[PDB]
Design a protein around this ligand. Structure first.
Ligand SMILES: Nc1ncnc2c1ncn2[C@@H]1O[C@H](COP(=O)(O)OP(=O)(O)OP(=O)(O)O)[C@@H](O)[C@H]1O
Ligand SMILES: Nc1ncnc2c1ncn2[C@@H]1O[C@H](COP(=O)(O)OP(=O)(O)OP(=O)(O)O)[C@@H](O)[C@H]1O
Ligand SMILES: Nc1ncnc2c1ncn2[C@@H]1O[C@H](COP(=O)(O)OP(=O)(O)OP(=O)(O)O)[C@@H](O)[C@H]1O
Lengths: 338, 366
């Protein structure tokens, strides 16, 4: 039926729905930012279209400025008269058609300037138009150059690359139940200063009466040294041991599948090749937690080097796990201990 | 040609030293060795049978940005030459079709005409001229003895197409050059490690020590030291953890994992109960399947890039009973260190028992 709520999905990307946020209006800086945040298939198109539109716009202006002076009349009557009676008076030499104005604009801005179409020193309006057009062309070229530099810089990153298991396990390890999951890497480099944090999502209350709605917490990931940095070259099985103080201690075994909990995993680090800090997220819910199972080993010795095979990443076989809550194993040994 | 037609000689006699020498072992171990990471970085694992994700052209561009400086110039030059040539051929075909080549040849064979009033693209007469006109249009030179009259609109289309593509080429190549010039400090990493490891006696318990130093005149900031032991174990309930990496404390005055790296240092590691080195003895520590990894992290203030340096130790290289010679020495007016005494180790009084028992038998004597 209607889906029961999750906090963050099976592919990260927190599903929260902020609503009625007090928003301000438009900051055109946001539009420019969209300009730099683009796809190449569209960046190339707008890049070309800017130049095409600019040339056409200044071509129409150039035709008008060739219209104002006595230019078109002179070049239309010279053909009839076949007389060189218009040698020097014209405003922009040999500009006599909208096509010719368009060609002159192309010549002037990309700095081609073939030089058969000279620009005299007479019509001040024309000199104003030339100054304006040259400045606009310089600005446009600089902006697009900046766009290309940002594109090249943001080329290297492709997509998130740290991979978490289909589901997790809850095994028995060293005389106390432990929550385990599997994390792997697909990169060529390795993640510097990697860190892993685990959280328990549960709707909670406080004994004195306050109400906490989607409260977070944190569960102590274990190392023999009480520290959280982890080095990831082989696929790893992150583990967390159940103590009396984690909220993952009073749950039962059979009745986990019908129980309101969520386990969020956050893995951060800094990539060595390009030096960009990254954070990858995932979550496990009640429906996708297989109690009492355990992961099979995947690293073996191939007589030349160690060898692992991620094709067998998510397979998980069931082995022994006592049918009691992780509390019953310590409050009353005779209840569980055997 | 048919070397061994006469096949008759078979099983007459061989009867020889092939393995029945009896004074030489028949076996040939051949001594192959596998370590978790090579002695000089380059983690050597074996990923295979991974569900592949195909390829995408953005990866080709990503390769374009990451090239050695002796290939960027080559791809630059090839790109420029190919572009000029391609548009030269387009211009040559345009000149051919519109009847310009014939007009120029016929009216220049006899100079009587001098007619250039009806031509598609003036003063293009050969492929040489077309491959000099395309030069004058792409690089924004514009020599201008060859105007483009306004008539033939196909030529104008070609000019628009070529100018825009030329700008694209110029912008992309400038971007590549700038990106490679900005990230030009980033040569490589030059962290120097001692190779041999001692287990001396100091401060009432054993140790685990080596030496590390830099070469760049910039010291490394927020340097952190991590030491791990690689071994295969199983749960008491019996599950194969294939290559368990166990973290072990590196001692320090306040138990924190930063180190300040200016003069080379000893990196101690006191063996205590939790440490996996509790159970290793003198004659034992030549035979063992263990690999101790060391991970050094920091940033270099000059380039502003985070760096991670890796090395690996095996039980075979580690030589019990030694320590490191005091490389430093107060000189005439200023301290100094001779890195030439890097791998040099000396021997001194070394107990031969295990730290497992160096508290069990409570006599500092062994
Ligand atoms: N919805 C919101 N959007 C943006 N900023 C907010 C929002 N709510 C609170 N803030 C920030 O918190 C502070 C709230 O102070 P303020 O005195 O405006 O509270 P308030 O608006 O009276 O609260 P309420 O409207 O809920 O009664 C402000 O500085 C504001 O920047
Ligand atoms: N060998 C592999 N090669 C490439 N990607 C992998 C590999 N193993 C796992 N992944 C990635 O890790 C994620 C988790 O895979 P997992 O094995 O946990 O799920 P799964 O049930 O095997 O998924 P599927 O049913 O699609 O095979 C997947 O989305 C997948 O993209
Ligand atoms: N003066 C030095 N310059 C550069 N590297 C050094 C120097 N001294 C030692 N090393 C490093 O120490 C590591 C061990 O090398 P090796 O065992 O061949 O020499 P060593 O005994 O440590 O020192 P030496 O060669 O001075 O006797 C090498 O990786 C090497 O790079």
């Amino acid at each position: 039926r209607l889906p029961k709520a999750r906090f963050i999905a099976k592919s990260g990307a927190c599903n929260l729905a902020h609503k009625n946020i007090r928003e301000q209006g438009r900051f055109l800086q946001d539009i420019f930012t969209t300009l730099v945040d683009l796809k190449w298939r569209h960046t190339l198109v707008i890049f070309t279209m800017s130049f095409l539109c600019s040339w056409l716009l200044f071509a129409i202006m150039w035709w008008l400025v060739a219209f104002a002076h006595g230019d078109i009349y002179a070049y239309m009557e010279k053909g009839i008269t076949e007389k060189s009676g218009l040698e020097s008076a014209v405003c922009v030499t040999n500009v006599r058609s909208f096509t010719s104005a368009f060609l002159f604009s192309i010549e002037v801005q990309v700095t081609i300037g073939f030089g058969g179409r000279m620009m005299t020193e007479e019509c001040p309006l024309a000199i104003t138009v030339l100054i304006l057009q040259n400045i606009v062309g310089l600005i446009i070229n600089a902006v697009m150059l900046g766009c290309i530099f940002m594109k090249t810089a943001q080329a290297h990153r492709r997509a998130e690359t740290l991979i978490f298991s289909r589901h997790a396990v809850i095994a028995v390890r060293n005389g106390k139940l432990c929550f385990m999951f599997r994390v792997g890497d697909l990169r060529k480099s390795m993640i510097i200063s990697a860190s892993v944090r685990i959280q328990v999502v549960k709707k909670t209350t406080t004994p004195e009466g306050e109400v906490v709605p989607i409260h977070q917490q944190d569960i102590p990931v274990d190392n023999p040294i009480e520290s959280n940095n982890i080095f990831l070259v082989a696929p790893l099985i992150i583990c967390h041991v159940i103590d009396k103080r984690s909220p993952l201690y009073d749950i039962s075994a059979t009745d986990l599948v019908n129980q309101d909990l969520e386990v969020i995993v956050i893995l951060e680090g800094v990539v060595e090749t390009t030096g960009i800090t990254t954070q990858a997220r995932t979550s496990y819910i009640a429906e996708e937690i297989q109690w009492g199972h355990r992961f099979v080993s995947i690293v073996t010795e191939e007589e030349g080097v160690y060898s692992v095979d991620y094709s067998k990443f998510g397979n998980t076989v069931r082995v022994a796990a006592p049918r009691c809550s992780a509390r019953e194993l310590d409050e009353k040994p005779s209840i569980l201990i055997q």
